[PDB]
Design a binder for these strands. Structure first.
Ligand code: MG
Length: 462
RNA sequence: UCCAGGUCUCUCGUCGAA
RNA sequence: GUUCGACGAGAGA
RNA sequence: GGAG
């Protein structure tokens, strides 16, 4: 992806937006209890912790575009993945507007607690001023879509979240692109049936993990990926994507049954326009993270990409024995024979992708069931029931979370939620976690679940 | 004086009235 | 208890 | 800009 052009929003008849410049995050009562290396991301150019230019840092992800055509490897990649998806019977018929907006099996309602994007954000207008799940009213919505139309600019915000202090110093904060309510609705009408079929079918046929519950899904993964493991990381995947990959996505969408007018919606993802503060800018390429379908489309593209690389690097690879599960850029895969991920990274480079060793490792060495991760979780077979597998989030990540709060009123919910992640590390580790929580006054006021109760509910869930 | 911060998935919690 | 609904939070991508 |  590449920022092609920047103009003042005033030139283009857009207002200055007003982007929150202060974190909601503050140290919690457990800040001194646990060790941690993360702090709230830099949100503004005048952050005292900055050791580099902030705006340069945040837009640096747009590394550029490769100018190459859809080659024979891509075509074969698209054909093979389209053949899997054909078994799922995805309807290309538009989703009913009420279902698209207020929810249906496999697809939750629009989030009414989030911004409505442009122009509503500059008009003081919220989603709740327009939509209500209690009434399921569409009258005010139809009228706002008629009035303001589609293909509105997305609004760039700096994401408020914890980051390593290294990334704080370099100002390497992440950006989100707020989709207009109108475009979210139009997207959901057009692709809603695809969305729900993916959500309902996580696994190696969609090549997607969206819709999964790691507590249950982790036990299925080794059954689905029974070959030699393949995993690697991407650097700035979303923003690294060149237009050729969107061209591929549109082709696979056509093979699914979508027409040109419908695939043209992808042009608004690939060739996108944005508001940041007092600027209006144009990006060619890059998946604008925050558009409707971000996860599904990033995952679909990841399925096209990794097939492409396999086919290019290894002639006589048999994709029918390839298995992969992607969640956006995150991926875990297998092939019956050892695949050199460093060679895939090499081919990836020519396609404008930056692929590095899994989990920020030093070399593209062997990926094993013991060291592989997915959705930041390790895999550990239950010692009692070896066919059941624990999703294991590292305690250090659980520690970073508990050390901060967006509101001390939520302490009970926050800490309970973390317990449900922590116990998969085992009873000893869990009790040490509970103990440190109980080492400060507030901790002793919390209702925390017993290890035995968690294990019991888990086994019961199967 | 106060508000402004995406798409989605999963899970937990508080409310439900069948 | 169980479903389905509305609201809050946490985590992941 | 929205609201009180
Ligand atoms: Mg990964």
């Amino acid at each position: 992806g590449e920022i092609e052009f920047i103009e003042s929003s005033k030139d283009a008849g857009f207002p200055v937006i007003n982007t929150p410049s202060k974190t909601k995050l503050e140290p919690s009562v457990f800040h001194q209890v646990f060790e941690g290396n993360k702090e709230p991301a830099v949100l503004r150019s005048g952050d005292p912790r900055l050791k580099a230019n902030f705006e340069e840092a945040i837009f640096s992800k747009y590394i550029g575009n490769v100018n190459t055509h859809v080659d024979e490897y891509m075509l074969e990649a698209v054909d093979h993945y389209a053949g899997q998806l054909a078994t799922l019977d995805i309807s290309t018929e538009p989703m009913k507007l009420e279902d698209a907006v207020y929810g249906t099996e496999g697809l939750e309602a629009l989030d009414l607690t989030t911004s409505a994007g442009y122009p509503y954000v500059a008009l003081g207008i919220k989603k709740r001023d327009i939509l209500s799940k209690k009434t399921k009213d569409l009258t005010k919505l139809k009228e706002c879509m008629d009035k303001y139309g589609l293909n509105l600019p997305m609004v760039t915000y700096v994401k408020d979240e914890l980051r390593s202090i290294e990334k704080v110093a370099k100002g390497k904060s992440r950006l989100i692109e707020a989709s207009s309510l109108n475009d979210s609705v139009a997207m959901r009408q057009t692709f809603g049936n695809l969305y729900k079929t993916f959500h309902l079918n996580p696994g190696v046929v969609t090549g997607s993990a969206v819709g999964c519950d790691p507590d249950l899904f982790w036990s299925k993964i080794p059954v689905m990926l029974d070959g030699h493991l393949i995993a690697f990381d991407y650097s700035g995947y979303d923003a690294s994507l060149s237009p050729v990959w969107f061209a591929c996505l549109k082709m696979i969408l056509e093979k699914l049954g979508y027409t040109h007018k419908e695939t043209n919606y992808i042009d608004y993802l690939c060739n996108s326009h944005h508001l940041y503060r007092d600027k209006h800018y144009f990006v060619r390429g890059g998946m604008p993270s925050g558009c409707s379908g971000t996860s599904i489309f990033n995952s679909m593209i990841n399925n096209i990409i990794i097939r492409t690389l396999m086919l290019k690097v290894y002639k006589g690879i048999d994709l029918d024995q390839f298995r992969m599960i992607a969640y956006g850029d995150d991926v875990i895969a297998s092939y019956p024979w050892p695949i050199d991920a460093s060679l895939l990274a090499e081919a990836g480079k020519g396609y404008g992708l930056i692929m590095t060793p899994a989990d920020k490792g030093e070399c593209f060495n062997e990926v094993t069931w013991t060291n592989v991760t997915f959705l930041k979780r390790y895999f550990r077979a239950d010692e009692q029931y070896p066919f059941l597998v624990h999703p294991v989030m590292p305690m250090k990540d659980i520690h970073e979370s508990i050390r901060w709060t967006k509101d001390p009123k939520n302490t009970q919910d926050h800490v309970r939620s973390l317990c449900l992640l922590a116990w998969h590390n085992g009873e000893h580790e869990y009790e040490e976690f509970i103990r440190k929580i109980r080492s400060v006054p507030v901790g002793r006021c919390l209702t925390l679940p017993a290890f035995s109760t968690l294990r019991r509910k888990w086994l019961d869930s199967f």
